[PDB]
Amino acid sequence: MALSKVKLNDTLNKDQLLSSSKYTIQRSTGDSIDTPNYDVQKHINKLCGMLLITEDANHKFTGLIGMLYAMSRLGREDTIKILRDAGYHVKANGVDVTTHRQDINGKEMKFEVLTLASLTTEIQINIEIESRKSYKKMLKEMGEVAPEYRHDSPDCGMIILCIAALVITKLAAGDRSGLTAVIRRANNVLKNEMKRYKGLLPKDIANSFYEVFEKHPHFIDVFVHFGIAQSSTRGGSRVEGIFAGLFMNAYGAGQVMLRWGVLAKSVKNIMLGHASVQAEMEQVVEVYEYAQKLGGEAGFYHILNNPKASLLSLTQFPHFSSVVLGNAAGLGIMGEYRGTPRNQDLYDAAKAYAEQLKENGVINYSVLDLTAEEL
Amino acid sequence: MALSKVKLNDTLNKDQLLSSSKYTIQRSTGDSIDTPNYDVQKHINKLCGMLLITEDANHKFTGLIGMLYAMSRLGREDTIKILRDAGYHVKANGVDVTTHRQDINGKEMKFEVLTLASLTTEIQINIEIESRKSYKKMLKEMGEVAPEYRHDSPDCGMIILCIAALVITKLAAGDRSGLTAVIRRANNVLKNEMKRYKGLLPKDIANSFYEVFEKHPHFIDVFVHFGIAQSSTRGGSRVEGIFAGLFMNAYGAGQVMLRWGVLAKSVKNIMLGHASVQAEMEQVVEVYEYAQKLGGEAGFYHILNNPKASLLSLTQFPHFSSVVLGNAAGLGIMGEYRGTPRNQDLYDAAKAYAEQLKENGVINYSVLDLTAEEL
RNA sequence: CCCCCCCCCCCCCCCCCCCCCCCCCCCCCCCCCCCCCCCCCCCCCCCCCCCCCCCCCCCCCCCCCCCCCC
């Protein structure tokens, strides 16, 4: 009564503080940023395809080029708007298509290029040159190139942005450690696409995206909001359906510990009753309700580096964290997860009880009632 | 009390996120799209009939031509409006009827053709040429062609869109695997129509529609909304009544697992009481209520590739999925369904109990009460 | 008719306060796993069948009200 009413709400107080700032910072991203408009979108897709048909393609620029497609889907105005909302000063760079004349192999030739701050009109033609090589070879092998194999396929842009989504998936750890997991999934999920494109090398493109995200961290914001806008969509090609699916696997990255909590509660893991865990409960509810209040935007807080994500940490509660992680251990869901319990005794006990849980399913008859049962 | 209040609502949080995007993407469909207006509709229907009276007809273009009829029913303005709503930039292409003069067999002839981006005025006349051949042969066989046998019949357009609807039915799996099922149904349901049209070859047209949907995936959106607008209708010919019926068989494709859930609950399958299934319940209700909240539009989420459809998956709950699928097994409704239980022990137990359920119907007397019963 | 007695009120004491006392002080970023989805089957309907039918206006008597006292 007396003392049981004394508490301090820290998790929600902190949100309230960061939510109600009366002033703002603004960052100076760099000297330029290219904001391709809707009108350029088809050409960027075409360029993406050129990379995908190129066998053993150099994927250095592919990360950056993917970002360009995504921005050309958002559109010049929408893309700037999302940059400004994030708070960065934007030197917007208009993107037009111009023809370039250059003699390759002696003979003078025409090329379709983009005016880009980020991409030399030199390294652009080099992608188209290399693509043609892998294309005439492709034409020699099958006599006639099918539409699913060409750089025209409307899927090309989105196909590249698929391994981008997979990169976002594992971006929670912040380092390149997700890479092998990214490849693995790209191989099962995307196996059909990899059959139609010799240049769909997961390792390489995944590295190129990691690269662009690490280097230009504002793009990670841009991409997240693109994916959201792409998943808002009413219908779409199976590839866009794949993209959206993969993109959404990243919702709630960094907060795995949170879901394994709901699990511990769901399976009624005994070690949740422990006195020293019960002591933490008052606050552990505070954070779960804060997660609830936050809603949808919250899932991506860890992928973008949103300071407010620190608040969802269950790390601050060692006893609870430990039994939750032990529960997940004993149910064989963790590993090769690199989280450590701060309480070995609790972790072990939770693991032990969890392991015993899968052994006996007891039928509970009071969930569904029947007025006459012979059995 | 304490811990039982802690939960995270993930299914609804995710919807909330995709519903409330502040930005949008837009796709560049291709170079052109033909948007036939109401005024051309009768001519397209006529062209459809020409294909239907042609014995052993080449159905390569029939898929695309069907889409044109549907668009000519929606009307130029309504059809563009649905494309823009889906988010695609539209190069609208006006469709006029012009006369073409060409010498076939030496003699010069007139033809009624459409100005179409998608269809050469060459391959158009070829359908009318082939139709005439099968028509004069038809005239020779029965002396005089009845109105139900000609290419004039107002049904022709809608008849073709019938196997289109059937293609939508099985589009849930995404591949051509529905094809044999599509044929089967076209044969029972449409047997009367197949009698009046030698050119109503299900396999061929079904393949042509699969073709157009796979190739131009925006058409699948257009067709879905056409069918909705066609089923909104107040009255109509028996064929339009067949179309609507078939079209609506596709409502809830991809969500069969969901209906088999409601079934498991309905038959009071015992394995729903199991501890490890009860553990999932809290969340499995979340998704069913999300389905409820979504309402009508939800049924087609899987057919169009609407990212939000991933959310209706009961896959995320292995224990529940397994007993639901086992229940459906034991009641002999699954197969040749290619879904797999993630819990063999539960699936087997549910199947076993389900098989035992059909054996004994016990009369429950407390649903209807009577103040005096001698028996 | 109503009405009819008596009758001002008040009257003491009293400022209030007065002590002690800043506060603070440790630790600690976070994160880390796996995983697209989907896949069966199925148009709907289908019987019988207009309705209605009788009787039947309503009404009818008695009667102003009031009247004392103060």
Q: Residues of B with CB below 8 A from A223's CB?
A: none
Q: Which helix (H) or strand (E) holds B231?
A: helix B218-231
Amino acid at A94: G
For chain A, the residue count is 375
Alpha-carbon B305 to chain mean position: 13
- Cβ-in-10-Å burial (0-12, 13-18, 19+) of A374 comes to exposed
Distance CA B162, CA B192 (A): 13
Q: How far is A163 from chain B (nearest CA, A)?
A: 17
Asked whether the beta carbons of residue A364 and residue B275 sit closer than 8 angstroms, the reply is yes
Distance CA B229, CA B247 (A): 11
What Å resolution does this PDB entry report? 3.6
Question: What DSSP string describes B165-205?
Answer: HHHHHHGGG-SGGGHHHHHHHHHHHSHHHHHH-TT--HHHH
Distance CA A275, CA A279 (A): 6
Closest nucleotide over all strands to A302 (CA to C1')? C31
Per the entry, the structure determination technique was X-ray
Breaks, C-N > 2.5 A, in chain A lie after none
Instruction: Yes or no: say if B343 and B320 are a contact pair by the CB < 8 Å rule.
Output: no
Instruction: Yes or no: say if B212 and B61 are a contact pair by the CB < 8 Å rule.
Output: no
CB atoms within 10 A of CB B88: 21
Question: What DSSP string describes B85-107?
Answer: HHTEE--EE---EEEEEEESSSS
The packing angle between helices A202-215 and A179-189, to 10°, is 130
Q: Distances in Å between the alpha carbon of A262 and those of A290, B3, B6, B323, B369?
A: 14, 10, 7, 22, 45
HSE-up of residue A181 (Cα within 13 Å, Cβ side): 15
The packing angle between helices A218-231 and B10-19, to 10°, is 100
Q: Distances in Å between the alpha carbon of A50 and those of A129, B24, B54, B357?
A: 9, 26, 42, 60
Q: Which residue has 């291709």 as its token pair?
A: B30
Three-class HEC string of chain A:
CCHHHCCCCHHHHHHHHHHCCCCCCCEECCCCEECCCHHHHHHHHHHHHHHHHCCCCCCCCHHHHHHHHHHHHHCHHHHHHHHHHHCEECCEECCCEEEEEEECCCCEEEEEEECCCCCCHHHHHHHHHHHHHHHHHHHHHHCCCCCCCCCCCCCHHHHHHHHHHHHHHHHHHCCHHHHHHHHHHHHHHCHHHHHHCCCCCHHHHHHHHHHHHHHCCHHHHHHHHHHHHHHCCCCCCHHHHHHHHHHHHCCCCCCHHHHHHHHHHHCCCHHHCCHHHHHHHHHHHHHHHHHHHHCHHHHHCCCCCCHHHHHHCCCCCHHHHHHHHHHHHHCCCCCCCCCCCCCHHHHHHHHHHHHHHCCCCCECCCCCCCCCCCC
Instruction: Yes or no: say if B11 and B298 are a contact pair by the CB < 8 Å rule.
Output: no
Q: Distances in Å between the alpha carbon of A354 and those of A74, A265, A284, A333?
A: 47, 12, 21, 11
Nearest to B84, CA basis, from B20, B22, B23, B29? B29
Instruction: Yes or no: say if A364 and B275 are a contact pair by the CB < 8 Å rule.
Output: yes
Q: In chain B, where do the E strands start and end?
A: 27-28, 33-34, 88-89, 92-93, 97-103, 108-114
Amino acid at A186: A
Which of A68, A363, A364 is the best residue to mutate to test the B interface, defined by the most B CB atoms within 10 Å of its own CB? A363
Q: Which nucleotides on chain C have any atom < 7 A from a protein Cβ?
A: 29-44
Alpha-carbon B313 to chain mean position: 19
Amino acid at A161: L
CB atoms within 10 A of CB A16: 10
Q: Which residue has 């009255």 as its token pair?
A: B235
Q: Which of residues 285-314 of A touch strand C (CB under 7 A)?
A: 302, 309-310, 312-314
Give distance CA A309 / C1' C66 (Å): 98
The rounded radius of gyration (Å) of the Cα atoms in chain B is 26
Compute the C-alpha angle B12/B18/B21, nearest 5°.
Answer: 135
**Which residue in B23, B276, B304 is closest to A234 by CB distance?**
B304
- Cβ-in-10-Å burial (0-12, 13-18, 19+) of B80 comes to middle
Instruction: Yes or no: say if B87 and B29 are a contact pair by the CB < 8 Å rule.
Output: no
Give distance CA A159 / C1' C1 (Å): 114
Q: Cβ of residue A258 near strand C, that is under 7 Å?
A: no
Asked whether the beta carbons of residue B274 and residue A230 sit closer than 8 angstroms, the reply is no
Q: Distances in Å between the alpha carbon of B55 and those of B45, B65, B166, B366?
A: 18, 18, 22, 62
Distance CA A100, CA A102 (A): 7
For chain B, the residue count is 375
Q: Residues of A with CB below 8 A from B10's CB?
A: 252, 259
Closest nucleotide over all strands to B246 (CA to C1')? C43
Give distance CA B103 / C1' C11 (Å): 139
Distance CA A50, CA A130 (A): 8
Strand B27-28 relative to strand B88-89, pairing: parallel
Phi, psi of B209 (to 5 degrees): -80, -45
Structure tokens at B304: 């169009």
Give distance CA B88 / C1' C50 (Å): 58
CB atoms within 10 A of CB B255: 20
Instruction: Yes or no: say if A42 and A69 are a contact pair by the CB < 8 Å rule.
Output: no
Compute the C-alpha angle B149/B150/B151, nearest 5°.
Answer: 130
Distance CA A81, CA A352 (A): 52
Nearest to B253, CA basis, from B173, B163, B181? B173
Distance CA B197, CA A114 (A): 54
Phi, psi of B33 (to 5 degrees): -150, 135
Distance CA A95, CA A92 (A): 10
Q: Which helix (H) or strand (E) holds B318?
A: helix B318-330
Q: Residues of B with CB below 8 A from A371's CB?
A: 364, 366
Instruction: Yes or no: say if A339 and A257 are a contact pair by the CB < 8 Å rule.
Output: yes
Distance CA A327, CA B16 (A): 30
Structure tokens at A300: 């991506």
Rounded (10°) CA dihedral B28, B33, B39, B41: -110
- Say whether B25 sits in a helix, a strand or coil: coil
Query: In this structure, is the dihedral angle defined by the CA atoms of residues B289, B294, B295 and B299, taken in order, positive or negative?
Result: negative
Distance CA B241, CA B249 (A): 13
Distance CA A305, CA A314 (A): 18
Instruction: Yes or no: say if B244 and B91 are a contact pair by the CB < 8 Å rule.
Output: no
Domain map of chain A by residue range? 1-375
Peptide bond into B336 cis (omega under 30): yes
Closest nucleotide over all strands to B258 (CA to C1')? C38
Nearest to B319, CA basis, from B340, B284, B346? B346
How many Å is the maximal CA-CA distance in chain A? 92
Structure tokens at B90: 């539209």
- Helix, strand counts (H, E) of chain B: 15, 6
Q: Distances in Å between the alpha carbon of A295 and those of A154, B18, B19, B40?
A: 34, 11, 12, 49
Q: Residues of A with CB below 8 A from B89's CB?
A: 38, 41
Within 8 A by CB and 6+ apart from B230, the residues are: B73, B240, B243, B244, B247
- Per the DSSP assignment, residues forming a β-bridge with B111 are B100
Measured between CA atoms, the residue of chain A closest to residue B11 is: A296
Distance CA B305, CA B295 (A): 17
Distance CA B49, CA B128 (A): 10
Give distance CA A50 / C1' C15 (Å): 99
Asked whether the beta carbons of residue A244 and residue B22 sit closer than 8 angstroms, the reply is no
Q: Distances in Å between the alpha carbon of B25 and those of B18, B216, B250?
A: 13, 18, 28
Q: Residues of A with CB below 8 A from B364's CB?
A: 371-372
CB atoms within 10 A of CB B82: 21
Which of B305, B327, B345, B353 is the best residue to mutate to test the A interface, defined by the most A CB atoms within 10 Å of its own CB? B305
Which 8-state DSSP code applies to residue B334?
-
Q: Which residue has 């029972």 as its token pair?
A: B188
Instruction: Yes or no: say if A273 and B11 are a contact pair by the CB < 8 Å rule.
Output: no
Q: Which residue has 């662009």 as its token pair?
A: A212
Q: Residues of B with CB below 8 A from A288's CB?
A: 6-8
Structure tokens at B100: 């073409």
Question: What DSSP string describes B37-67?
Answer: -GGGHHHHHHHHHHHHHSTT---TTHHHHHH
Instruction: Yes or no: say if B32 and B91 are a contact pair by the CB < 8 Å rule.
Output: yes
Phi, psi of B168 (to 5 degrees): -55, -45
Closest nucleotide over all strands to A335 (CA to C1')? C33
Within 8 A by CB and 6+ apart from A212, the residues are: A63, A64, A66, A67, A219
Q: Distances in Å between the alpha carbon of A226 and those of A165, A222, A244?
A: 11, 6, 11
CB atoms within 10 A of CB A90: 18
- Per the DSSP assignment, residues forming a β-bridge with A88 are A27
Nearest to B63, CA basis, from B248, B190, B204? B204
**Which residue in A38, A240, A365 is closest to B273 by CB distance?**
A365
Instruction: Yes or no: say if A156 and A62 are a contact pair by the CB < 8 Å rule.
Output: no
Instruction: Yes or no: say if B320 and B271 are a contact pair by the CB < 8 Å rule.
Output: no
